[PDB]
Design a protein around this ligand. Sequence first.
Ligand SMILES: *CC(=O)N(CCCNC(=O)C(F)(F)F)c1ccc([N+](=O)[O-])cc1
Ligand SMILES: *CC(=O)N(CCCNC(=O)C(F)(F)F)c1ccc([N+](=O)[O-])cc1
Ligand SMILES: *CC(=O)N(CCCNC(=O)C(F)(F)F)c1ccc([N+](=O)[O-])cc1
Ligand SMILES: *CC(=O)N(CCCNC(=O)C(F)(F)F)c1ccc([N+](=O)[O-])cc1
Lengths: 239, 239
Amino acid sequence: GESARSLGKGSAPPGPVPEGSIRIYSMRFCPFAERTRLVLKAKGIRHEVININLKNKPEWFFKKNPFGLVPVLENSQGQLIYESAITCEYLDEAYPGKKLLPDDPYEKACQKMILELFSKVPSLVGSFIRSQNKEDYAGLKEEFRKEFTKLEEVLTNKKTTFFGGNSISMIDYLIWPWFERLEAMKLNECVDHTPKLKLWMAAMKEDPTVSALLTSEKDWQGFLELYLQNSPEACDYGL
Amino acid sequence: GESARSLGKGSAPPGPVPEGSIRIYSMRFCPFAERTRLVLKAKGIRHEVININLKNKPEWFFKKNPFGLVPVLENSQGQLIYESAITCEYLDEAYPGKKLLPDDPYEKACQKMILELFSKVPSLVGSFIRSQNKEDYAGLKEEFRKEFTKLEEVLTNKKTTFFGGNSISMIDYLIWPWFERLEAMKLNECVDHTPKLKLWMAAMKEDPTVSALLTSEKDWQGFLELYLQNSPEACDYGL
Ligand SMILES: *CC(=O)N(CCCNC(=O)C(F)(F)F)c1ccc([N+](=O)[O-])cc1
Ligand SMILES: *CC(=O)N(CCCNC(=O)C(F)(F)F)c1ccc([N+](=O)[O-])cc1
Ligand SMILES: *CC(=O)N(CCCNC(=O)C(F)(F)F)c1ccc([N+](=O)[O-])cc1
Ligand SMILES: *CC(=O)N(CCCNC(=O)C(F)(F)F)c1ccc([N+](=O)[O-])cc1
């Protein structure tokens, strides 16, 4: 398990990705990178993982991604792909197995429009972990409710188990990581007025790919406290 | 030409889109909607246009797009697609003719990553038209230069005429509308330190699709003054 320790400042740049594998630069508690890892697992793609210390980054990491953000994919041809949704779409197109995006152009566009309806939530979760008292908290809960209602309306018309149909698909994996963190953030009462979205969270936790990657509330809390301290040890919490 | 007048508050909701055509809800001076119109023209797609008065919207327009924004596509099946990049990608996949996106997954991802490098520019152009004096202007010019340098680096490695190759393609059409407005915004000196990007603007203006859709500096200025007044007549400037 210690082989999952992150690479930080001073680390040597890694060698080439072996043929037959793809590499993801990740961080174990990063929801953006969890998107890509959910897709790797759902499609059964052989891969290796390099975790980056996001509080003490290797200088060489900026050669993998100018933005210095995870996730990044690197394949055996030496190609580099970043931005979470871009990496996920690349993986769906480039590898065989279950297609997580519809072939139909409209239904694929529909998945993207649902992603747009979700698009304010990640920055809200940002504000939430910043929140300082019960007044800020009450305000944040109402902001989440407003965004959640948008998603509830989609499920209400479709009456499907998942956002893309009765089968879990790309859109579900793209939005899941922020809902995963909701509990531990004590934002679980925001889904009370959105019953279908609440049932959707239950179905997601039953998905084999989701379940395999889910982090315990306790581990997430450990990370978050160190993260909020700007600790160089946050990314390796538990190792 | 008066048939291009916008529909506003009080207008009747339109009837169905005829078979064999797709409809775009647009506005003549809107760069986000220009993306979609560039793609419609480049692919030779038969279409009709409904311009929306964005300062005095029809209530029914919120039934086409909850966000109340253009562009929106509506086809003869009654399907609705919004968000500029989503509409463009849908059109490329759903219609025949020149494919504006690569089939290759990596090269398609590369186009999307270039879009991400551009992603701060539209909100900057927003700030720019807000700018109040020569001090704000000097500051804005440096912000544009920083973003333009990112794009210059791409062209420097690729040494291609366009961002996706030697043939104009999706990525070029997606970023063009903001560069179109640069002149009239007096931001044309921002590309001085980015020579390849400057030559790219010249090549774009030579493209038949771009040229066909380009708005004169004078018309754009007329719109902008009314827009900045919150005029209900801004969207119909010149009609
Ligand atoms: C990797 C990742 O997703 N992020 C950005 C989101 C961080 N916020 C949260 O996890 C949430 F708000 F709780 F959801 C990221 C970026 C940087 C670090 N870091 O350790 O410096 C961690 C996570
Ligand atoms: C893809 C999807 O599920 N959407 C967005 C598609 C276009 N929107 C519409 O058709 C509109 F809502 F009528 F404008 C979606 C989003 C929301 C609902 N809903 O029941 O409110 C349906 C479909
Ligand atoms: C349609 C469109 O793109 N917009 C948003 C961008 C507006 N800014 C500019 O045109 C730029 F900054 F100069 F580039 C839009 C939205 C609303 C209106 N409106 O008339 O209310 C116009 C344009
Ligand atoms: C698609 C593209 O042109 N890109 C981004 C691809 C991945 N990035 C890289 O390979 C990296 F730059 F090495 F990290 C692109 C962007 C910028 C350049 N450049 O010459 O700086 C090349 C390619």
